[PDB]
Amino acid sequence: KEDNIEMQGTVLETLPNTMFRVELENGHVVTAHISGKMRKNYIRILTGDKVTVELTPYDLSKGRIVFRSR
Amino acid sequence: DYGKFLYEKSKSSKEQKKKQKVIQVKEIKFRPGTDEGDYQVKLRSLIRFLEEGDKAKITLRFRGREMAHQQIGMEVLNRVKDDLQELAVVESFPTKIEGRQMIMVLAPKKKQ
RNA sequence: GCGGCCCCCUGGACGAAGACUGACGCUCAGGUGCGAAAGCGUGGGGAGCAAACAGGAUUAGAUACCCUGGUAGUCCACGCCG
RNA sequence: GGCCGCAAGGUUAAAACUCAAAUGAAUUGACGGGGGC
Ligand SMILES: NC(=O)OC[C@@H](O)C[C@H](NC(=O)[C@H]1NCCC[C@H]1O)C(=O)N[C@@H](Cc1c[nH]cn1)C(=O)N[C@H](C(=O)O)[C@H](O)c1c[nH]c(Cl)n1
Ligand SMILES: [K+]
Ligand SMILES: [Mg+2]
Ligand SMILES: [Mg+2]
Ligand SMILES: [Mg+2]
Ligand SMILES: [Mg+2]
Ligand SMILES: [Mg+2]
Ligand SMILES: [Mg+2]
């Protein structure tokens, strides 16, 4: 959390367990899982959207989605 | 009248049937979600229909925000196009969506 | 597991009263037999059925339920399976 | 692995690993292309 990393990306394909494959503005692909409120707000994500992706410096291969472009 | 009279009509009917065996209606449906080769399993059934002679109508469904997927959905229809390029003649292509469905129709190539 | 009728060979069970042997009993690891239907081997038989399979339908699809057929099997003799 | 079988297979019979359960009877409601008045 300290010194967080903030990026956008595009979701490419659906995975089981509501996890997702997202290409990143820098060319990298990451594995993403949903946050609580867009889970609590019943907001479902489809293929192809632009999404805001939080990253952590410990590992950049997997991130978390926090905001989807409708 | 005599019973024999029944056959000549039957022979004509089967001439109509072999004219109609193609006109039997078989429907195939797909979704943008379909993936992992389940598409190939359904193609296996399309093949068995064309060799018989029927036309096949390929339907594909978008629900609401799945419109973003029409850009990929038309390709799924195209993936049929390439697979049947030597099996089925292109007949009708859906230029527009109606009521959330794209409808495509193909008929088997009449091998010479 | 056993169902038409008759004959032949044969096991078991139960009741009455009396006589006889004199505990000769109960259970049982290993062991040995019997054991529906389906199935296997060799040779017969084959009406009715009926997996597989052919054809007609149904459905979005229907390798099914439904309709017309139909092979193994079902039957017999001797082995096997357990 | 052993034994049996012409073959299908039968019989004897484990562990790694994984979860905080699985289960039986009965109770009050909802539901049935279940009944009755
Ligand atoms: N996609 C797809 O598989 O088909 C759609 C499916 O819903 C058809 C449906 N079929 C059935 O119930 C089966 N029940 C068992 C016997 C055969 C069949 O009947 C059905 O609706 N039947 C109707 C008649 C019908 C119209 N189109 C096709 N079949 C029907 O009469 N059903 C009877 C009932 O409601 O009890 C019953 O099934 C029946 C009696 N006799 C016959 Cl034939 N069927
Ligand atoms: K005595
Ligand atoms: Mg006797
Ligand atoms: Mg004594
Ligand atoms: Mg014993
Ligand atoms: Mg038998
Ligand atoms: Mg039949
Ligand atoms: Mg109960």
Cα separation of the termini of chain A: 26 Å
Number of strands of chain A: 5
Strand order of the largest sheet of chain B: 1-2-4-3
Quickly give the structural class of chain A: mainly beta
Biggest sheet descriptor of chain A: 5 strands, mixed, barrel
Task: Tell me the number of helical segments of chain A per DSSP (H or I, 4 or more residues long).
Answer: 1
Number of strands of chain B: 4
Estimate the global geometry of chain A from the Cα principal axes.
globular
Number of helices of chain B: 3
Approximately what portion of the residues of chain B adopt beta-strand conformation? 15-25%
Radius of gyration of chain B: 18 Å
Structural class of chain B: alpha+beta
Q: What is the H/E string of chain A?
A: EEEHEE
List cofactors, ions and other ligands: the ligand NC(=O)OC[C@@H](O)C[C@H](NC(=O)[C@H]1NCCC[C@H]1O)C(=O)N[C@@H](Cc1c[nH]cn1)C(=O)N[C@H](C(=O)O)[C@H](O)c1c[nH]c(Cl)n1, potassium ion, magnesium ion
PDB class: ribosome
Keywords: GE81112, ribosome
Entry title: Complex 2 (BODY) 30S-IF1-IF3-tRNA-GE81112
Chain A: Translation initiation factor IF-1
Describe the model.
This is part of a larger assembly, with chains A (70 residues) and B (112 residues). By secondary structure, chain A is mostly beta strands. Chain A is 7% helix and 53% strand. Chain A has one helix and five strands; from the N terminus they run βββαββ. A five-stranded mixed beta barrel of chain A has the order 1-2-3-5-4. In chain A, strand 2 (20-24) and strand 3 (29-33) form a beta hairpin. Chain A is globular. Chain A starts with a strand and ends with a strand. In chain B, strands 1-2-4-3 form a four-stranded mixed sheet, covered by helices on one side. Chain B contains three helices and four strands; from the N terminus they run H-E-H-E-H-E-E. Chain B is elongated. Chain B is an alpha+beta fold and 112 residues long. The A-B interface holds A 13-14, 46-49, 70 and B 32-33, 35, 65-66, 68-69, 71-72. Bound molecules: the ligand NC(=O)OC[C@@H](O)C[C@H](NC(=O)[C@H]1NCCC[C@H]1O)C(=O)N[C@@H](Cc1c[nH]cn1)C(=O)N[C@H](C(=O)O)[C@H](O)c1c[nH]c(Cl)n1, potassium ion and magnesium ion (6 copies). The structure holds two RNA strands. The PDB classes it as ribosome. The entry lists the keywords Antibiotic, initiation factor, GE81112, 30S, ribosome. The entry is titled "Complex 2 (BODY) 30S-IF1-IF3-tRNA-GE81112". Chain A is Translation initiation factor IF-1. The organism of A is Escherichia coli.
